[PDB]
Design an enzyme around this catalytic site. Structure first.
Site, PDB file in Angstrom:
ATOM      1  N   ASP A  49       0.854  -1.161   0.000  1.00  0.00           N
ATOM      2  CA  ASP A  49       0.000   0.000   0.000  1.00  0.00           C
ATOM      3  C   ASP A  49       0.898   1.221   0.000  1.00  0.00           C
ATOM      4  O   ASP A  49       1.843   1.239   0.771  1.00  0.00           O
ATOM      5  CB  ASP A  49      -0.829   0.054   1.332  1.00  0.00           C
ATOM      6  N   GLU A 182     -11.156  -0.096  -2.317  1.00  0.00           N
ATOM      7  CA  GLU A 182     -12.168  -0.779  -3.113  1.00  0.00           C
ATOM      8  C   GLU A 182     -13.198   0.156  -3.666  1.00  0.00           C
ATOM      9  O   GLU A 182     -13.652   1.085  -3.024  1.00  0.00           O
ATOM     10  CB  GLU A 182     -12.878  -1.738  -2.183  1.00  0.00           C
ATOM     11  N   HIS A 296     -20.507 -11.658  -0.879  1.00  0.00           N
ATOM     12  CA  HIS A 296     -21.131 -12.897  -1.238  1.00  0.00           C
ATOM     13  C   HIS A 296     -22.318 -13.180  -0.414  1.00  0.00           C
ATOM     14  O   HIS A 296     -23.170 -13.975  -0.767  1.00  0.00           O
ATOM     15  CB  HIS A 296     -20.137 -14.019  -1.060  1.00  0.00           C
ATOM     16  N   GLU A 376      -7.558 -11.751  -5.241  1.00  0.00           N
ATOM     17  CA  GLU A 376      -6.915 -12.091  -4.010  1.00  0.00           C
ATOM     18  C   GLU A 376      -7.799 -13.008  -3.161  1.00  0.00           C
ATOM     19  O   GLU A 376      -8.942 -13.318  -3.445  1.00  0.00           O
ATOM     20  CB  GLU A 376      -6.611 -10.813  -3.219  1.00  0.00           C
TER      21      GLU A 376
END
Length: 491
Positions: A49, A182, A296, A376
């Site tokens: 990062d 994200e 999910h 990932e």
């Protein structure tokens, strides 16, 4: 031809805080033995990062690249390539926090006087992890908009690191687009009480987003339309909310209009900043990338609630990911996904999780739109089972003993390089996971050999009007997955 055409590279993510808040590269000698451990195992590279909040700490345009330069040197000395994340988000912030890295204090300072710069849920709670898309173009940060800040930062990076770029250390530049880097809304904030199988909340309540919306419903002919007030609280379950219940509001022309607006802000957010990135790195031998979240849970109820609140307008009859892939295609970017390890039979049954099918949907959509797809693991795993999951996803149709596979992922960035990983029995399986990813070939240092040469980034292709992006909402059947990989870690 060569089996080598089957090789899928493997990256390992460095430890959080390798360069501390203080902009200090802490333990060079330590990382060093680790990095060397990795290179011997056959690891292709590493991912780090690049905290916006460490670098532009002192003030606008006061960048200090030194500690990162030292870090890149050492990697390069270890024979590893490197994926850099343009992290414009906060690190940690909650309880028993490993590392805590807030965003630039000078930005924080502006937010004490203008709270509407943060994501805000309906109760009015200010999330400080990241600047709301509502300010992308508000010239309120000492004369700069947020996109300008991000743009400048990428430009400064490009210039102050040309040496490493020129030398091919840096393979890809991952552009951070929201919380956790994200492209999504801060919908499930641990820091706010969020617990897992929980639906989360919509984050469109800052003055900027609210005003945007109201102007838009007024143009649409329904000035009276308001933001969701029946969606519930983070921890709800959907049948328990008016929005998400069966025949709920999320199926109303007012809810659909909302969801389209809300999801479209991300698309436009990503598109513009990726524009700036393409500018910043034009010419360089790198690939651009974005991280898309793997939500999910509730994937298996018609309402796909946690996805909706996150800004992913994905329903059983509305593909909400393929539009992202399509957007990415004009920038020649990579879609970097996760939850690559998860199996359906691993989740609480009352969470209605559909990780495997989620993955099939996202990957298929990318391949379909003719982009590159990476991923990932979402969580730390050390077992053959995780590993074999990751391996199947990587080469969904198995190895081509006769060429390149018809379908293969562009790379997989394993999560976390800890002492645990490095532990004997653990590392031993890793080495195997690495071998199989590489399709049983030895680590290959020239990427051209397995068809991954990097070319100098070109300019983006022209804008794709939202009406054309939205066409990609048309649902399609995924591609066919083998039940199991033909290349198992576990003998």
């Amino acid at each position: 031809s060569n089996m080598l055409l089957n090789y899928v590279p493997v990256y390992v993510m460095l430890p959080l805080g390798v360069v501390n808040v203080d902009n200090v590269f802490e333990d060079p000698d330590g990382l060093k033995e680790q990095l060397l451990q990795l290179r011997a195992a056959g690891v292709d590279g590493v991912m780090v990062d690049v905290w916006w909040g460490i670098i532009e700490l002192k003030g606008p345009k006061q960048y200090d690249w030194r500690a990162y330069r030292s870090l890149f040197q050492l990697v390069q000395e270890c024979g590893l390539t490197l994926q850099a994340i343009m992290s414009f988000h906060q690190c940690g912030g909650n309880v028993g926090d490993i590392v805590n890295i807030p965003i630039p204090q000078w930005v924080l300072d502006i937010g004490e006087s203008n709270h509407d710069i943060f994501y805000t849920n309906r109760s009015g709670t200010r999330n400080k992890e990241y600047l709301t898309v509502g300010v992308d173009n508000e010239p309120i940060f000492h004369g700069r908009t947020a996109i300008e800040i991000y743009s400048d930062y990428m430009k400064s990076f490009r210039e102050n690191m040309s040496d490493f770029l020129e030398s091919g250390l840096i393979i890809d530049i991952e552009v951070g687009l929201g919380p956790a880097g994200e492209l999504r809304y801060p919908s499930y904030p641990q820091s706010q009480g969020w617990e897992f199988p929980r639906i989360g909340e919509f984050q469109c309540y800052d003055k900027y987003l609210k005003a945007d919306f109201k102007a838009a419903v007024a143009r649409a002919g329904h000035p009276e339309w308001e933001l969701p007030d029946d969606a519930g609280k983070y921890n709800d379950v959907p049948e328990s909310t008016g929005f998400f219940k069966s025949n709920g509001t999320y199926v109303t022309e007012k809810g659909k209009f909302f969801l389209t607006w809300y999801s479209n802000k991300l698309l436009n957010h990503g598109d513009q900043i990726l524009d700036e990135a393409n500018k910043a790195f034009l010419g360089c031998k790198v690939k651009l990338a974005i991280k898309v979240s793997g939500i999910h849970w509730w994937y298996k109820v018609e309402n796909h609630a946690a996805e909706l609140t996150a800004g992913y307008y994905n329903l059983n009859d509305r593909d909400g990911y393929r539009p992202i892939a399509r957007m990415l295609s004009r920038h020649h970017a990579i879609l970097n996904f996760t939850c690559l390890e998860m199996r359906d039979s691993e989740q609480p049954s009352d969470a209605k999780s559909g990780p495997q099918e989620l993955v099939q949907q996202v990957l298929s959509g990318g391949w379909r739109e003719d982009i590159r797809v990476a991923g990932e693991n979402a969580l730390p795993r050390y077992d053959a089972t995780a590993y074999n999951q990751i391996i199947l996803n990587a080469k969904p149709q198995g190895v081509n003993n006769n060429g390149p596979p018809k379908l293969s992922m562009f790379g997989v960035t394993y999560l976390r390089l800890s002492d645990d990983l490095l532990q004997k029995s653990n590392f031993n399986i890793f080495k195997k996971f690495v071998l199989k990813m590489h399709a049983d070939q030895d680590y290959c240092a020239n990427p051209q050999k397995y068809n991954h040469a990097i070319t100098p980034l070109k300019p983006s292709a022209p804008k794709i009007p939202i009406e054309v992006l939205l066409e990609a909402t048309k649902p399609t059947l995924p591609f066919p997955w083998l039940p199991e990989t033909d290349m198992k870690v576990d003998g």
